[PDB]
Ligand SMILES: Nc1nc2c(ncn2[C@@H]2O[C@H](COP(=O)(O)OP(=O)(O)O)[C@@H](O)[C@H]2O)c(=O)[nH]1
């Protein structure tokens with residue numbers, strides 16, 4: 001094990017928010033519209049450097065539909081961090097951030113680091129969730145918040161580099 | 172006889188019809204008066220073959236008028252039988268594993284062309300749906316988005332849509348899906364509005380030369396279908412990403428198969444990218460307003476084995492009633508979990 005740390009992160013959120021494109025932009029640094037929907041689980045592995053260290057990140061992907069929640073749960077426990085993703089062009093996806101949070105509690109360990117992320121922010125025309133409304137709810141929980149665009153690589157790397165530091169700042 | 176006659180129905184079928192003609196003649200046995208353990212049957216030339224399974228041992232019965240003869244199949248013989256059965260849903264009472272004509276490796280991003288082909292055409296084993304879940308309001312919530320993304324990337328998707336063994340051109344479905352109002356940003360809970368005679372013609376004509384004699388029949392057919400709300404319901408319902416999650420039973424299995432998939436993927440290819448799903452294989456038949464439709468939607472999610480990148484085929488079948496409306500609401504109610512039948516099958520590369 002040449003790495004210094006091995007973190008298990010997990011992406012959650014409704015279907016189509018952009019969980020995958022996010023992970024792909026972070027791992028392979030590319031964004032496409034061909035890889036179709038995600039049925040079940042999936043995972044990608046990327047190693048970074050924080051404070052002259054070597055952290056092997058094992059991010060997990062999941063299905064946004066409610067029906068998948070049950071079987072998805074098995075992957076919650078054992079996770080160092082959870083990234084709840086929502087579509088800034090979709091009101092619904094944000095209204096549900098409530099549930100995706102309540103779920104983190106019912107399965108993951110309370111000492112787990114959380115980070116809210118509003119994706120698709122490049123579609124300014126269709127935007128409907130105000131930075132402030134979210135930045136609001138984000139701080140009212142002590143959860144770091146960021147606006148990302150997997151399409152343009154906006155804050156995509158920062159979102160993960162943040163989660164990496166948040167966790168390293170513990171163990 | 173002294174021991175009877177020497178004539179064997181099997182030898183006849185063998186020299187009388189092709190191998191596939193024979194297999195295609197088999198159907199799942201649902202009848203009340205079926206032999207014990209009969210999971211499939213076939214009738215060709217006054218003979219009636221019955222494929223029974225008892226004590227986990229498959230035996231073939233040939234009923235010719237009144238005489239009855241049977242053959243118990245060895246393990247290998249049986250695994251072969253399954254390996255050559257029609258892509259239907261049989262009650263095999265166990266998820267089997269078909270092996271494809273190709274040696275897998277752990278250095279590829281997708282299943283080999285042979286694995287996919289094998290998958291698309293192999294039969295599947297039914298998972299008893301008794302403790303079926305109840306209709307929830309979040310059902311088919313993502314239907315529109317799903318079909319969009321799938322058909323969108325159909326150019327690099329093993330996805331295929333058929334209507335009575337008649338392949339419906341993806342281009343056509345691409346314009347249909349659009350003229351119906353399905354695009355990047357559409358309301359999840361929206362209700363689709365049918366199309367005018369012009370709209371379907373605009374579509375049909377953009378894919379079929381009016382001066383054509385060739386696909387003249389396919390033309391008229393699709394012209395009809397595209398106007399039937401029930402059809403649009405079938406076509407669209409078939410892509411909903413959670414169509415196979417229908418009961419705790421199914422969940423238990425599906426859960427297990429995924430674990431096995433993930434495990435092997437962890438141990439054998441941690442740094443190798445692997446596509447999640449290969450696509451959809453939807454088959455819609457007009458049942459013998461308008462008419463109702465029978466659907467068979469199969470997903471080809473990648474599945475890692477001891478040999479290489481395989482595929483776990485999950486097939487779901489239901490019945491869309493003549494009076495059905497294209498909406499997240501209409502579908503989650505006309506197609507409840509109990510009206511669906513899920514079956515599994517695993518297709519692996521070789522050593
Ligand atoms: N315009 C835009 N669309 C995005 C962006 N990220 C994702 N999407 C859209 O979201 C669709 C589905 O996203 P995906 O990441 O596959 O979501 P998941 O199923 O929740 O994992 C994509 O194919 C894109 O059309 C983005 O930064 N900008």
Ligand SMILES: [Mg+2]
Pocket residue numbers: 019020021037038061062
């Ligand atoms: Mg995904």
